[PDB]
Amino acid sequence: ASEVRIKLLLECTECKRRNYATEKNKRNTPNKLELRKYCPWCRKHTVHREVKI
Amino acid sequence: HGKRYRALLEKVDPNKVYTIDEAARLVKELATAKFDETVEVHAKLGIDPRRSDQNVRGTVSLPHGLGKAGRIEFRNDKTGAIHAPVGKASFPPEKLADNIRAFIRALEAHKPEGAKGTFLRSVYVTTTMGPSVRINP
Amino acid sequence: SKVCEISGKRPIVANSIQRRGKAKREGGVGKKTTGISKRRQYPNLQKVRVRVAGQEITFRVAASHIPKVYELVERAKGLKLEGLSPKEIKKELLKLL
RNA sequence: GCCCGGAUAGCUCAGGGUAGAGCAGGGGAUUGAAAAUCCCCGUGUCCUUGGUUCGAUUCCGAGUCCGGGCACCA
RNA sequence: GGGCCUGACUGCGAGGCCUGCAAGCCGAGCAGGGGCGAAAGCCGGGCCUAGUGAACCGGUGGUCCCGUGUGGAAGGGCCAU
RNA sequence: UGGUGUUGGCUCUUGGUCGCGCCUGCGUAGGAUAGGUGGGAGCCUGUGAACCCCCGCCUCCGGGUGGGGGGGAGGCGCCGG
RNA sequence: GGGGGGAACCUGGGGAACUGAAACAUCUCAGUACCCAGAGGAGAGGAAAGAGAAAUCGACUCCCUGAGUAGCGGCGAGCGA
Ligand SMILES: [Mg+2]
Ligand SMILES: [Mg+2]
Ligand SMILES: [Mg+2]
Ligand SMILES: [Mg+2]
Ligand SMILES: [Mg+2]
Ligand SMILES: [Mg+2]
Ligand SMILES: [Mg+2]
Ligand SMILES: [Mg+2]
Ligand SMILES: [Mg+2]
Ligand SMILES: [Mg+2]
Ligand SMILES: [Mg+2]
Ligand SMILES: [Mg+2]
Ligand SMILES: [Mg+2]
Ligand SMILES: [Mg+2]
Ligand SMILES: [Mg+2]
Ligand SMILES: [Mg+2]
Ligand SMILES: [Mg+2]
Ligand SMILES: [Mg+2]
Ligand SMILES: [Mg+2]
Ligand SMILES: [Mg+2]
Ligand SMILES: [Mg+2]
Ligand SMILES: [Mg+2]
Ligand SMILES: [Mg+2]
Ligand SMILES: [Mg+2]
Ligand SMILES: [Mg+2]
Ligand SMILES: [Mg+2]
Ligand SMILES: [Mg+2]
Ligand SMILES: [Mg+2]
Ligand SMILES: [Mg+2]
Ligand SMILES: [Mg+2]
Ligand SMILES: [Mg+2]
Ligand SMILES: [Mg+2]
Ligand SMILES: [Mg+2]
Ligand SMILES: [Mg+2]
Ligand SMILES: [Mg+2]
Ligand SMILES: [Mg+2]
Ligand SMILES: [Mg+2]
Ligand SMILES: [Mg+2]
Ligand SMILES: [Mg+2]
Ligand SMILES: [Mg+2]
Ligand SMILES: [Mg+2]
Ligand SMILES: [Mg+2]
Ligand SMILES: [Zn+2]
Numbered sequence: 001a002s003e004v005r006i007k008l009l010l011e012c013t014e015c016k017r018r019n020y021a022t023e024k025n026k027r028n029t030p031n032k033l034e035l036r037k038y039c040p041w042c043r044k045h046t047v048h049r050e051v052k053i
Numbered sequence: 054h055g056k057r058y059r060a061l062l063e064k065v066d067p068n069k070v071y072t073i074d075e076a077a078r079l080v081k082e083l084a085t086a087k088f089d090e091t092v093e094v095h096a097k098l099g100i101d102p103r104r105s106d107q108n109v110r111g112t113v114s115l116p117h118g119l120g121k122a123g124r125i126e127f128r129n130d131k132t133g134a135i136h137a138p139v140g141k142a143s144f145p146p147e148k149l150a151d152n153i154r155a156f157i158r159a160l161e162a163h164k165p166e167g168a169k170g171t172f173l174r175s176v177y178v179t180t181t182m183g184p185s186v187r188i189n190p
Numbered sequence: 191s192k193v194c195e196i197s198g199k200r201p202i203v204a205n206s207i208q209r210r211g212k213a214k215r216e217g218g219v220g221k222k223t224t225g226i227s228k229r230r231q232y233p234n235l236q237k238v239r240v241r242v243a244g245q246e247i248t249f250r251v252a253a254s255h256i257p258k259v260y261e262l263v264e265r266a267k268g269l270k271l272e273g274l275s276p277k278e279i280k281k282e283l284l285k286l287l
Numbered sequence: 288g289c290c291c292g293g294a295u296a297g298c299u300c301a302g303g304g305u306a307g308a309g310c311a312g313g314g315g316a317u318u319g320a321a322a323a324u325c326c327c328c329g330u331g332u333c334c335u336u337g338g339u340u341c342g343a344u345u346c347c348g349a350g351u352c353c354g355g356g357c358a359c360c361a
Numbered sequence: 362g363g364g365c366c367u368g369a370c371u372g373c374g375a376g377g378c379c380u381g382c383a384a385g386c387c388g389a390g391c392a393g394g395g396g397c398g399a400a401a402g403c404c405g406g407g408c409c410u411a412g413u414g415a416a417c418c419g420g421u422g423g424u425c426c427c428g429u430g431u432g433g434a435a436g437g438g439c440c441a442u
Numbered sequence: 443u444g445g446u447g448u449u450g451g452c453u454c455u456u457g458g459u460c461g462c463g464c465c466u467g468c469g470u471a472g473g474a475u476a477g478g479u480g481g482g483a484g485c486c487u488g489u490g491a492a493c494c495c496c497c498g499c500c501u502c503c504g505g506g507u508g509g510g511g512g513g514g515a516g517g518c519g520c521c522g523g
Numbered sequence: 524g525g526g527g528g529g530a531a532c533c534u535g536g537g538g539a540a541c542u543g544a545a546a547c548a549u550c551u552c553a554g555u556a557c558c559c560a561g562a563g564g565a566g567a568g569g570a571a572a573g574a575g576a577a578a579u580c581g582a583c584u585c586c587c588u589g590a591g592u593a594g595c596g597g598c599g600a601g602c603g604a
Contacts, residue, residue, distance in 0.1 A: 009422080009442070018422055021442060022369065030351095038394055040371050041423095045395055053421090053442070056489050067462075086484080093481055102478095103347050105338060130479035131339090138481065181481055203537075212359055212419095217288085219361060219419045222597080223549050228538090236448045253448055288420090304469040361418050417598075430576050 010048035012039040018051060057085060061183055071186045073153050076178040077146040083183035084142035089120075090181040092142060094153055096135045096160060099170030107165035109135055115152040120144065125156070133174070135160065142180055153178060157190050191232040194252040196259060196287060199233040243271040247280050262286055 001007055005025045009018040010033065019039055033050040054062075064082050071079075084090040100107050108129060115123040120141045127137040139152045157176065164172050179185040193200040208225040212218020234253040239246055240263050249259050262283045271279055 007442090011422085016422090017424095018441070020370085035367055035369095036395080037367070038370050040393090043371090043394065045367095045370090051422090055486060057485090059489080088483075091481055095480080101347085103339075105347080128479085132478060134479075136480040179481090182485085200536095214419075216359095217420060218359065226549080234447060238448095256448080359419105361416100361420105 007053045008033070009051045009053055010035060010037060011051040012037075012041060012046045013049050014046050015039060015041045017041050019048065021053070024050070058182070058184070061085060065184050065186060067187075069187075071178075071188050073150045073188060073190075074146070076186045076188050077150040077153070079186060080142060080149060080178065080180060080183075081146070084180045086180075086182040090142040090183065092139045092149060093179050093181070094137055094139050094156055095177045095179065095185070096157075096173060097175040098129055098133050098135055098160075098164075098168075099172050099174040100129075100133060100165060100168040102129075102131055102133050107168050109160065109163050109165070111159060111163045113137075113156050113159035115139065115155055117144065117148045118152045118155075127156075127160075139178075153188075191235045192250065194233055194235070194255055195249050195284070196251045196255040196262075197233075199252050199255075201230045201232045204229055204231045242266055242279055242283070243274065245274070245276050245279060247276055247283065249280075258287075 001023060004027050005023060007021065007023050010020040010022065011018045017039070019041075020037060022033075024033060033048075035048050036045050037048045038044070039046040039048075061083055064079065080092055098109055100109065110126075110128040112124050112126045115125065117123075118125065118140045119138065120143065121138075125137055127135055129135040137156055139156055140149050157173070160173070173190050176188050176190045177185045178188055191201065205226050206229045207223055209221045210224045211221045214220045235250055236253055236256070238249045238251055238256060238259050240249070240259060241247070242263055243266075251259055265286050266283055269282065271282060274282070
C-alpha cells in the first residue's frame, strides 16, 4: 500500500454489510469499485460497492 | 396603526398561547374589516431554509375551507416560514379548527427526514387585516 | 494554615496525579499516569474578628464555617460575659459548639 | 482522527446583479544611459461537479488539491 | 491479442512440506452462490521464490451473545477490518 | 497565570444572548430606495389628510424614516402599461 | 484532674527505599520499616441511612470455609475481596 494505492472494503449493496476488503490504486481507478460478489448474509451474488475503510 | 386595529389589539395578549379552539372563537372578534376576511395560518418550520431535500411543499384538501372548495398548495419560503389560507372569517368556529388542524396535519406529513429542531418552532392564526395569536399546534 | 477553630478541619494529604493521553470515552487509547506525588490540601482558613461584650475576639476559621461564628455570637446574648478577658470569652463561645 | 479555512489573469491579490486592482509582458510618449514617471492594451467555467434564483465567483450539497489549527499514536 | 467476466469467492478441508516454539508453505475433495466454455473442464488472484510485524491497548461496520433486584441503558463479547 | 472563596458600597462605559417595540433592503425596465414569500379591493383622517417650521437620524445623494409646532379634507392602492 | 514510665500487642496522625518488574517511569516492595500522638490489660469495632437477590439475612469482633474465586492489572510483574 501507499497513499495512492489504498485499502478499501466492499459492502453488499443489498444488506449494507462490508464483506470483503481489498486494495486499489486511486489514481488508476478514481471511481468507486463495483463488483459482483457473494454476500454470505443474503446467500447470493450481489453487486458490492467500494466503501472507505 | 389605525384606531380600528389598535382596538383589536386589546382582545389578544402575546404571552398567552391559546388553543385551536380558543383562536377560532377570536377570529370573528378579529375580523373587523369591510369584507369576509380570510384567516391564514403562519408557521415557522424549524428546518434549514437555504437547501432542498428538506423543502416543505405540497397540498391539503381542507374538509370545509376557502369558501371563495379545498386543495390549497403551500410552500415554505426562503426563510423558515410557511403560510396558507384556512378559510374566510365567516365559517362557524367549529369549522375553522377543523381546517387549522387539518392543515397543520399536512405540514407534519411533509416534514423532511433530515430536519433538526422542533419543526413547528411556532404557529399563529390571524385574519387578513387583524392581529395574530400563537397556538398550541 | 492549620485548623478550623469551629469545624476542626485541618490539612489533609492528597496525591497530585499527572496523566497523559486521550480517555477511552473520547475514543482514545486511554490515560497513562506520568506521575503521582503527595501534596497537601489546606482548609480555606481566614480571620474573623467579632466584638462581644465590647471586647474583640478573633477566630481562625475555614471560610465555610464563617456564619457559624456569627451564630455563636448570637447565642452568646444570654450569657453572663461582661468583665471577662478575650481569652475566656472565646473559651465560653466555643463551649457552645 | 477532528475543527477552521484559501483556489478569482503570467505572479500576488480584494469582491446575491460586475468582473476587476498592483507590478510583470507589449505598444507609444520621454531619455546620452538605467530608471522613475505618463497614456493605451491584453492575461478568465472566479478549483470540480451538482443544486437555488429570472439569473451568480457570491447562497447551499458534494468532491479534488494545496494552506492553517488541535489532538492522538497500540 | 481479443470476447465474456470478478473465483483477488463464502462455509470447510483429507493429506502433507518445513519446523525447538510460534509461524511459514502446498493442497485434492464436499456444500453454497457464481464466471467462462459446445464440452472435457478450469477459476479460493498474479510463472515462482522478497514486497513484512506476534501480543497488548484502542478505532470503525456488523451480530444481538452477556447486561450486577427487574425492564432498558452504560459497558463488554463474537464476526469483519 | 485564568476561574473561584476570603470579597464589600457607589458610579460611568461596553459586548453576548433572549423577549418585545420600531426602522434599515437602491443591478437593471420603471411613477422610484421593490428584502422573501403569503393574504388581499380596500385602507388611512375629528383617535386630524395636503403641503409647511425644528428635524432622531439613515443615505446608494435621488430619497428613506420619525417624534413634534403650523394644519382643516384629501391622500394611497386594485386598475395598468 | 493532667504530666512520666511500660517487652511485645493496639488504634490514630504521618510515612520511605533497597527490591520485584531479569533495564524503567505507572505498578511492586507497602501503608511495610520508621517517626509521632494516644490507650490499656488489652486496643480497635459495634446495635444498620448494612448486606444484596434470597419474596432473604439481622450489632461488632475472631477462627475455618467460600478462594487464589470474583475481580484488579505498563491485562506486565504481580495484586486480591
Ligand atoms: Mg481479502
Ligand atoms: Mg487492485
Ligand atoms: Mg453469517
Ligand atoms: Mg493534580
Ligand atoms: Mg492505565
Ligand atoms: Mg460556602
Ligand atoms: Mg472530517
Ligand atoms: Mg493565482
Ligand atoms: Mg481476457
Ligand atoms: Mg464472491
Ligand atoms: Mg493439516
Ligand atoms: Mg510447525
Ligand atoms: Mg453454460
Ligand atoms: Mg461444470
Ligand atoms: Mg479448488
Ligand atoms: Mg504490555
Ligand atoms: Mg481489543
Ligand atoms: Mg439479552
Ligand atoms: Mg435480556
Ligand atoms: Mg443495579
Ligand atoms: Mg439491570
Ligand atoms: Mg420498561
Ligand atoms: Mg452495545
Ligand atoms: Mg458491539
Ligand atoms: Mg493560582
Ligand atoms: Mg474574587
Ligand atoms: Mg501514661
Ligand atoms: Mg504514656
Ligand atoms: Mg496509621
Ligand atoms: Mg502507623
Ligand atoms: Mg519523605
Ligand atoms: Mg522503586
Ligand atoms: Mg530503584
Ligand atoms: Mg529491576
Ligand atoms: Mg533485575
Ligand atoms: Mg538499573
Ligand atoms: Mg500499597
Ligand atoms: Mg481478655
Ligand atoms: Mg468505640
Ligand atoms: Mg440507633
Ligand atoms: Mg499489583
Ligand atoms: Mg497493596
Ligand atoms: Zn448482503
